[PDB]
Every structure is written in C-alpha cells, then in structure tokens.
Design a protein around this ligand. Structure first.
Ligand SMILES: Nc1ncnc2c1ncn2[C@@H]1O[C@H](COP(=O)(O)OP(=O)(O)O)[C@@H](O)[C@H]1O
Ligand code: NA
Lengths: 583, 82, 212, 82
C-alpha cells in the first residue's frame, strides 16, 4: 500500500475513509493478497475444492502448508505456536479431523524456542507431529523459516465447501474472544485448549449436517473470512459487527473487523439451523453468534447496529492487483559444489513431539517419509522436502530436484504419489523478479514431468536483513496412497546402494520405476541427500540395529538410494553391495 | 563474601492476554464460585547473589533477566529483596 | 453379552479415541461418558490421556475438581477397577485416590519414545497375564512424568532406564485395596503390531481375567 | 464492593529437587557467567478479590490455594498484598 493507493482511488472515484484504508492495507498486502504470485499460480496444474485429494472414493485426505516466518522472527515460541494454530483451522474448514502435522524449520541453530513452540501446541490438540525438516545453516541466521503442514482425513459424503452457495444464508462466527490483537499490536499467544474445543465443536456440526460452507480466521480476520466466503460464490454479505463476541466491549468498529485474533472460525448455514449451532458452541465452552447475511447483490456492506462504516464491491477485495510475470526458460544442469548444512540428529527434536497420538501412525519419523492409516481402510504417506543448498547455485534446477527428490522419498515406503503442496520462501521480488520465475516455472515443469498436480500453496516474500535476500527455498509436501500392511519395517539385512553417483533428468523415471519394482517385492528403501544421516543411525538403534557400510561418495545432485533387501536386487540400474545391518 | 537474597516476579505485559490465567480465572469464579476479578499467572524466581555492594547485586539480577529469565518482548518483571 | 467399560471425555482429552479402540478389540463394550453422567452401570472406568483442560495450571488439576470426581470416588470405594493412563494418573493423584505426585521430567521437556519396562508385580487385576518381571515394550508421552514417592506405595511398573528421573524408576502404582491403577506408559497404543507392539493388549486381558 | 490486590508466591519445597531450575543455574553461570548460586523456580499468581473487609478477602485467597492453586504435596506458598 506504498504505491497501490493510486490504483484504489481510480476504482472508488474518491478518497478512502479510515475504515477502508486499514481494510485494503491488510487485504492487498503480500500475505493474503498474492500480487507477485497470482498469475504464476494459475499456470501450475491443480486437482471443485482446493486442498482435498481423493484417496479411496470412500475417504479423502485434506492438506495444506502455511508459512509463519514473520511472527517467528520477533518471537520464536509464540510464533511457531501461532503457526500450528492457523494451519490446523485451514484443514478443519474442509470438515476433516487434523490427523498429522509437519514442521519445516530453517535456522542458524536448533532454537529451543521454535521447537517448544510446535510441541506445546501440537501435543495439546492431539494431532501427531509425524515428521518435518531441520535444515540448519548460518545463511538463515537473521531470517528463520517455519513452514507447518497440517493434514486431515474426511469422508466424501461429509465434505464441506469453502464458499456461500445460495442467498438467504447466514454466516456464524464462533470460537475464542475477539480482541485487540491487530512489538506491540502484532504479538499474540495461542490457546491450544480452545483450538481442541473448536475442533470437537466443528466436527459435531459437520456430522449434524449444519455446515454448508466454512473458512478459517487467520490473517485479516472477520474481513478476510466473510469476504472470501462470498467472493468464491459471486454473492454478497451484510456484516453486523455488534454481534461479534467481544473481549473488550470498548472496541471501535474498524478494530472488530481487522481483528486478527486466533482460535476463531466461520460457518455458513441456514437461519433455522443456527439455533442448534450456537448450542454446540456453548457446550464446548466457546462463544458465538450470527454476524453476516448472504444477499444476491455482489457488494460487501459493513455496519455496527444501525450506522454504517464501510461499503465497497465484494470482488474488489478478494482480487488484488495482479503484477506481470517475467517468464523464464530453462538452462543447462550446472555442476553443483557441496554447501555445508550442519548434520544434526532429528530424534532430539521429534522426541519432544507426540508422534503416536490418534493411534493412526504406522511409520514414525526418522527414516524420511511417514505412513498413516484410517483404522479400517487404507492409508496415506506424507513427506516434506526442500533442496535449499542447490537452490542457492541454481534457482531453477535446485528447486526442480527438490520436487523430484520428494517423489523419490514417497516411493521409498511403497506409496504411489497423489499430490504436492508448495511454499515459496523467496527474498525481495521487485529487486529480482527473475529468480521467483525460475522457481515457479521449476515447480510448474516438475509437476508435468511427474504428472503430479498441486492441491494448495503459499508464498511468504520480502525476507531480507541488511537488505541482503534469503536463499530461495521451496518446500514441497507430498501425499501418496498406500496399504498400511505393505510397508517396509527395518529387518536385519544386507545394504545395497542402487542408482548412479551423477544426475541426469534424461533417465530419472528409470530410478522411480526401479524403486517400485523393489518395494512391492518387500524391501526397505532410503532416499536422502547425504545417503545416510546421523538421524538414520539413531532411529536404527531404537529398533536395536547397527549399520556398518562404505557409502559410495556421490555428487550433491544425485540419483541414488540405499536398499535393505535379503538377496541381490533385480533391477535395471547400478546395484552395488555396501554392507550389513546386523543384530 | 557476601550473600544477597532476591525474588523475581515475572508476568505477561498489560496489553498481552494470557489464556492460561484466563481459563483459571474462569474456573475460580464459575466452578468454585469465589468472587475473584482478574487473574494473572506468571513465574517467580528466587536467587542468591554473591557480589560486593547492594548496588552491584541488583544489577547482577538485571543482567540475568534481560539475557535469559525474562523475555523482553512479552514478559514484564519486578524484583524485591528477601 | 460382553463386559461394560467407559472412557471419560474431559474437556481437552486426546487419547479417548485410542482407549475406545483398545477396549473394543479386546473383548469389552466401551461407551463414552461425559460430565454430569453416572458411572454405576460400568465395571471398568478408564481415565484417558492427553491434555485435560490444556494442562493450564497443573496437569488435570482443573479436571480433578470436576463433578464426575464425586462419581469416580463413589466407584472407587465400591471397588470397581479404575485405570488412569498418562494424563489420567495425574488426575488420580490430584483426586487423592493415588499417593504421591507427578512433576516435570528432569530432562526439561516432552518425551515420546518406546520405553522398556519390567513388571515388578502381578497378582494385580491389571498385570496377571504377565510373569513376575516380564520385559515389555509399551510407549510414553510425558512432559510431567516424574513420580515422587510420599508413602510406601505399591510399585507395579518400573522403567528399565532413567527416563523422567521418577523415584525408584516408577511408571505405574496401585491403590491400598488394589482397584485403582496409576500408569504413565500408554497401553492403548501397544495393541496392534502396526503401531509398534502387542505387549500391551495383555494389560486388558488381565482385566477380563479378574471379572472371571 | 472493594478490591484487594494479592500476589501468591508458590515454590517447590526446599528439599524437593527441581532440575528445571538446576538447568537454569548451569546456563547463567557457565554460558552467561554471573556469580549466582542457589536458585529455585516456581509460579507467581496475582489475583484481585471483592469482599466486605480485608480479613474476609484474605480468606478467599487462602481457600483458592488449598483446593486449586497450590499442590499441598510438594508446593509451599506465601501470600503478600499489592
Ligand atoms: N524438526 C523435525 N520435526 C519432526 N521430524 C523431523 C524434524 N526434522 C527431521 N525430522 C524427520 O527426520 C527424518 C528426516 O531426516 P533427515 O536427516 O532430514 O534426512 P532426510 O533428508 O531424508 O529428511 C524424517 O522423518 C523427518 O520428518
Ligand atoms: Na486461509
């Protein structure tokens, strides 16, 4: 809103009021506006709901990843904690029970603050933290990244929309109290207890069949929730702010609208089914009332009882000014030198997280990918990967190998890929709109090569200190279909290094179809950047196993995995015997 | 030589809402029915210092706060002698 | 035609869905019981794990001063078997049906691992399907699992090593009579070999064996 | 309807081990290097109360401590006014 002001004045035909100036300074920001990414995001192949993937025609898994790097910069604990909160709700809005969370951390040292953040929150809501990243390097020192990925399971005959379908409907706001939360007006503590009461409250409203549409209240709050609920429906809404559950009754109308208070949710239902929805909230210790009315005219009316404060067209809010793309075309696969990333033990970080709650975790973290189940059905496998060390030398091939090496880790357990979830953590997009394109086109092409679509995404730009940008890191989140019985559990066997030391895309699909011919055969595969990490040897010791091998030194960009079978692997790719895994 | 007993009373700042203390405030007034308006729940750290004067002792406690015990962003504090 | 069991859903409990499931596949007929409910009709009262009332002042203390305490105590004196797991143990020590207290782990924060235990006592309605000293693999998830002995209490389960720094490596204790069980390791997780082990479905087979 | 500000200092018994506190003593002597021996860690609860007089107000605080706030097993408390 430093230059986008002049573009707003010509669409309104006058000067904006104090209510409108604060509304569009948050709605047309780079967080919930997407000005430098909206046009690239349409070019990427998607999967009529954005965030859900069909698994068994009976069930469907809902997953998304958000980036809370900015509130984690000022305060680590209450930042990462706040992060798990806003992503858990974006999954619950689809009517799914949050079944798995991931934490993609990128710091200078294992900051006890960010770690304890995801812990005290994730464990308090009974959602297992079944894995995550821990890329430690002094390049992130003054700019840490925290990408939390929440996942949930849901029946297809109980799925919830994310838009208001017809007029004559009402939007109900419930959850925690709505106060003054938006080094002063930006720091807030999360209430993981209210979040659990919000989950069990919402999921009873779903089974009661009273949810016809819903949206989370994270960034922007009541404004960015009720406006985006009628913007994807092409309809409108009349918002009464006197009906919003206030904590401090002495709040001015604009503060009730722009309030970015947590633990709140938005539900679209009919006025006859609202008397039963508020009784479910009061039963779960939550506060709620009817705030908005869905009309036919595509306008957004905001008033406070009888007097008005703001009225602007609905589509002028959800659609931010789309910047122009600078299409990038691919260059030669460079010779990558090894960028030293401190090799740490992930056990010390996840043994602080409840990764077994729900009793649905089949494969606990340590050996990359994590496999889950649905207690009856079938299961799903999620992995989180980002080749940050390669992305530094090449903004394209580094980011492309990240999407491919992700699919490599998903086939290692025995799961056939279904979807991807992106998260762009670029530096300044105006000083270098060239590097952002090399990344977005690296994710577009890598999704056409593997034929794996993108369900949902995110982008947190402007990450700089001293003016110097952050290493372009794209975090991929895979999802795959698997049978919880046909999973690789570490047995005492001989270790084989399969694949080749060098990288060449021209024969990458030959490694994938080589891993597949080895998984349904009953072997344990391990795909990692450094082949075997400190983490792998420590998770092996917990299974009472010791590993002694001669790891063939590979180049940073490689196509190799370690296979632990009984007899010599029968595949059409280099198979060398490197050791054993006794006792 | 010499001893100096202290007690730190940490708390979340005035503007920051503490749900921990607000859930207990709501319990003591509705479930236990005791007329109690407006609780805060923080940390109280007792520590013995070995310094020189009374002046040198107080500034020791102050460095241990700004560097570890009291988070300068959301926490506020006030120390008293023992 | 099968025995009656119940899992108490306290506002904030996370391991209720795990208790129900662990009870269903082990010969019982579970039923979720909330607050203001009566526990007369049940033969086994399970006090579930998780974070009851978000552990806001102290673990399950805000749950111990709840209405169904007057109903658990009534069932305790009557002699009906009560088993409080991870968070439930913390509730029973604050209710006073169990001796001692549970404080924060010596190793500062949360522990979620597959811990090795030795059953120092069978001839207990919850551990008679085990030998005297069987080495069992059953998981945990603590941030407050440090047991502190206040009275010569009846030791049931002991860790092999040193996890929380709990006095005499205590994982599980019993009542005076022997109907109320306090447990730190989660047994509702060691029922299927998919999640990890089966050493814990014998804790349940032991309850069916008491009810002849 | 008069208000009486109180502050309850809760601490673990002088012989009950608090390694959460021995870990804090480790750091800010070896990592922050200050001469500070002998340090215990606990809770600090502030609560305002409505009653007739001050002697009947203190009775409400003393009740709340016995039956919720303080664990009489390993915690000791000392209340003061504000
Ligand atoms: N911060 C973390 N939180 C939870 N799990 C983690 C964390 N860091 C790493 N892990 C888990 O450890 C394993 C990854 O180990 P790592 O050394 O990164 O090898 P890889 O390159 O295969 O991920 C996966 O299970 C990953 O989810
Ligand atoms: Na959202």
């Amino acid at each position: 809103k430093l230059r986008y002001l002049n573009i707003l004045k010509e669409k309104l035909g006058r000067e904006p009021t104090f209510v409108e100036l604060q509304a569009f300074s948050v709605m047309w920001s780079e967080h919930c506006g997407y000005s430098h990414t909206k046009k690239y995001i349409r070019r990427l192949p998607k999967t009529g709901n954005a965030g859900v993937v069909n698994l068994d025609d009976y069930y469907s898994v809902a997953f998304k990843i958000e980036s809370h790097n900015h509130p984690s910069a000022i305060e680590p604990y209450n930042g990462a904690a706040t992060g798990v909160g806003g992503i858990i709700r974006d999954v619950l809005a689809m009517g799914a029970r949050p079944t798995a969370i991931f934490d993609s951390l990128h710091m200078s040292r294992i900051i006890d603050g960010i770690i304890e953040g995801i812990a005290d929150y994730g464990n308090s809501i009974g959602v297992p933290t079944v894995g995550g990243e821990l890329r430690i390097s002094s390049l992130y020192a003054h700019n840490p990244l925290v990408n939390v990925l929440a996942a949930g399971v849901v029946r297809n005959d109980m799925l919830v929309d994310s838009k208001a379908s017809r007029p004559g409907q009402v939007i109900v706001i419930f959850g925690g109290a709505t106060g003054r939360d938006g080094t002063k007006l930006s720091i807030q503590v999360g209430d993981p207890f209210a979040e659990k009461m919000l989950i069990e409250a919402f999921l009873e409203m779903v089974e009661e069949g009273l949810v016809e549409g819903a949206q989370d209240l994270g960034a922007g709050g009541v404004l960015s929730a009720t406006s985006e609920l009628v913007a994807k429906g092409n309809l409108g809404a009349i918002v009464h702010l006197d009906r919003v559950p206030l904590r401090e009754p002495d709040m001015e109308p604009w503060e009730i609208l722009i309030s970015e208070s947590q633990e709140r949710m938005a539900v679209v239902t009919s006025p006859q089914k609202a008397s039963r929805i508020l009784e479910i909230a009061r039963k779960h210790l939550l506060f709620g009332d009817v705030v908005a009315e869905v009309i036919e005219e595509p306008v957004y009316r905001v008033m406070y009882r009888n007097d008005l404060v703001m009225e602007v067209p609905v589509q002028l809010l959800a659609n931010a000014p789309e910047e122009d793309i600078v299409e990038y075309t691919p260059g030669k696969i460079p010779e990558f030198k090894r960028v030293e990333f401190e090799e740490v033990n992930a056990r010390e970080v996840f043994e602080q997280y409840d990764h077994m709650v729900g009793t649905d975790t089949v494969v606990p973290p340590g050996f990359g990918a994590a496999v889950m189940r649905i207690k009856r059905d079938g299961g799903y496998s999620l992995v989180t990967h980002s080749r940050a060390d390669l992305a530094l030398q090449d903004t394209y091939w580094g980011t492309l190998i990240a999407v491919l090496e992700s699919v490599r880790k998903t086939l290692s357990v025995g799961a056939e890929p279904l979807a991807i979830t992106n998260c762009v953590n670029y530096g300044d997009p105006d000083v270098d709109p060239v590097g952002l394109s090399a990344m977005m086109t690296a994710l577009k092409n890598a999704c056409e090569f593997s034929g794996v679509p993108v369900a949902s995404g995110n982008a947190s730009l402007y990450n700089t200190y001293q003016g110097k940008p952050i290493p372009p890191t794209l975090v991929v989140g895979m999802l795959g279909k698997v049978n919880p019985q046909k999973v690789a559990k570490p047995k005492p066997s001989k270790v084989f290094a399969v694949g080749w030391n060098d990288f060449e895309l021209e024969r990458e699909k030959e490694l994938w179809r080589a891993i597949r011919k080895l998984s349904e055969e009953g072997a344990f595969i391990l795909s990692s950047s450094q082949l075997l990490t400190r983490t792998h040897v420590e998770t092996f010791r917990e299974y009472g196993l010791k590993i002694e091998v001669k790891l063939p030194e590979v180049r940073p960009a490689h196509q190799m995995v370690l296979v632990f079978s009984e007899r010599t692997p029968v595949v059409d790719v280099p198979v060398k015997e490197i050791g054993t895994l006794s006792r | 030589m010499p001893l100096f007993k202290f007690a730190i009373d940490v708390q979340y700042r005035s503007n920051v809402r503490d749900p921990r203390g607000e859930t207990i405030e709501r319990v003591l007034r509705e479930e236990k029915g005791l007329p109690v308006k407006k609780l805060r729940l923080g940390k109280s750290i007792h520590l013995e210092v070995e310094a020189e004067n009374k002046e040198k002792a107080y500034e020791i406690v102050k460095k241990a706060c700004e560097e570890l015990l009291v988070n300068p962003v959301v926490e506020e504090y006030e120390v008293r002698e023992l | 035609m099968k025995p009656r069991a119940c899992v108490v859903v306290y506002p904030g409990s996370n391991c209720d869905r795990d208790a129900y499931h662990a009870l269903e596949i082990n010969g019982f007929e579970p039923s979720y019981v909330g607050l203001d409910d009566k526990l007369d009709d049940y033969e086994l009262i399970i006090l579930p794990g998780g974070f009851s009332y978000g552990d806001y002042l102290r673990p399950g203390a805000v749950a111990a001063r709840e209405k169904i305490a007057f109903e658990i105590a009534k069932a305790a004196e009557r002699g009906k078997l009560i088993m409080g797991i991870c968070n439930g143990f913390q509730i029973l020590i604050e209710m006073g049906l169990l001796k001692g207290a549970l404080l924060q782990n010596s190793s500062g924060k949360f522990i979620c691992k597959w811990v090795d235990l030795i059953v120092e006592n069978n001839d207990t309605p919850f551990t008679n399907a085990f030998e005297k000293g069987e080495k069992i693999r059953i998981p945990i998830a603590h941030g407050f699992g440090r047991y502190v002995k206040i009275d010569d209490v009846n030791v049931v389960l002991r860790y092999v090593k040193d996890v929380n720094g709990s006095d005499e490596r205590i994982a599980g204790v019993l009542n005076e009579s022997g109907n109320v069980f306090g447990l730190m390791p989660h047994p509702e997780r060691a029922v299927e070999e998919l999640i990890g082990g089966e050493d814990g479905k014998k804790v349940f087979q032991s309850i069916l064996n008491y009810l002849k």
